[PDB]
Design a protein around this ligand. Structure first.
Ligand SMILES: Cc1cc(-n2cccn2)cc(C(=O)NNS(=O)(=O)c2ccccc2)c1F
Ligand code: NA
Ligand SMILES: [Zn+2]
Length: 268
């Protein structure tokens, strides 16, 4: 019997996939997580006791982003081993293709939190290899289900690439991307490419955004905005074909914007 339902903060959330919590925790009906330190418990009474004991009101690590009540925390797998393992155990409940939850030292995690008077509440996260050989600026990305399809996920993609802009490199998410993930990247890419051509070689669109050319190209093929000439992909679009696509219904909700002004990060 596996964990199938968590209680975290003020939400109960059904599980989507199997997550390797220790067998004693699995056999429980419900798992109870401190929304700040991510400690998981088997009983409401231990949960309730911890709630009055817990002194954490925010994630560990450094607050590298803060605009309004949106915040992002940098947490190093090496410096916060237990926390990051709980994080991956939580994320595995909603990621089919994540395979890594105890070997956290090679990774750095970026926690997205929403702040109120009581504290900074975890919305989602993405992981990132300290040293990625395949040039992957994202390993796993996860938005908690009650926060999905409301901007936070795209915000993390943007934030992932702004760190890519500060390291002077291009990066692509590791694969396979989940179903919600595939649709969120194509949408982000489309929106960033379209609003760069309303405002260029493919190699230029690749350095101005740190999007890999394959991701640029494949998105432009999805828009029918690229011609092929003797083995080469060429952007072909009129400013009108950028503007209809840009104002089509899909790009109408006001996103949460990464204001680089408010990003207190420096490359290693
Ligand atoms: C990468 C990613 C992953 C997950 N996820 C995976 C497992 C569990 N969750 C959820 C989201 C998401 O929340 N997408 N919706 S969105 O942020 O509002 C949004 C709006 C416009 C354009 C692009 C996105 C997401 F982006
Ligand atoms: Na649910
Ligand atoms: Zn705690």
């Amino acid at each position: 019997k596996y964990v199938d339902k968590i209680h975290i903060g003020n939400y109960e959330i059904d599980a989507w996939y199997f997550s390797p919590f220790p067998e004693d925790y699995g056999k429980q009906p419900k798992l109870w997580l401190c929304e700040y330190c991510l400690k998981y418990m088997k009983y409401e009474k231990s949960y309730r006791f911890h709630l009055g004991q817990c002194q954490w009101r925010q994630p560990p690590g450094k607050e590298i982003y803060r605009k309004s009540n949106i915040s992002v925390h940098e947490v190093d797998g090496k410096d916060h081993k237990i926390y990051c393992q709980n994080l991956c155990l939580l994320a595995k409940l909603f990621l089919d293709h994540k395979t890594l939850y105890f070997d956290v030292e090679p990774f750095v995690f970026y926690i997205l939190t929403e702040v109120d008077r009581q504290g900074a509440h975890i919305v989602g996260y993405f992981s990132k290899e300290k040293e990625s050989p395949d040039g992957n600026n994202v390993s796993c990305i996860m938005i908690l289900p009650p926060y999905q399809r409301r901007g936070y996920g795209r915000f993390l993609i943007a934030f992932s690439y702004e760190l890519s802009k500060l390291e002077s490199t291009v990066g692509s998410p590791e694969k396979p991307l989940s179903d919600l993930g595939k649709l969120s990247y194509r949408s982000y890419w489309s929106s960033v490419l379209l609003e760069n051509l309303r405002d260029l070689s493919i190699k230029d669109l690749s350095q101005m955004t740190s999007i890999t050319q394959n991701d640029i190209i494949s998105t432009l093929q999805s828009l029918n905005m690229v011609k092929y000439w003797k083995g080469q992909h060429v952007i072909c679009v009129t400013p009108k074909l950028v503007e209809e696509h840009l104002k089509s219904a899909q790009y109408k909700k006001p996103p949460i914007t990464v204001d680089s002004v408010c990003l207190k990060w420096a490359p290693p």
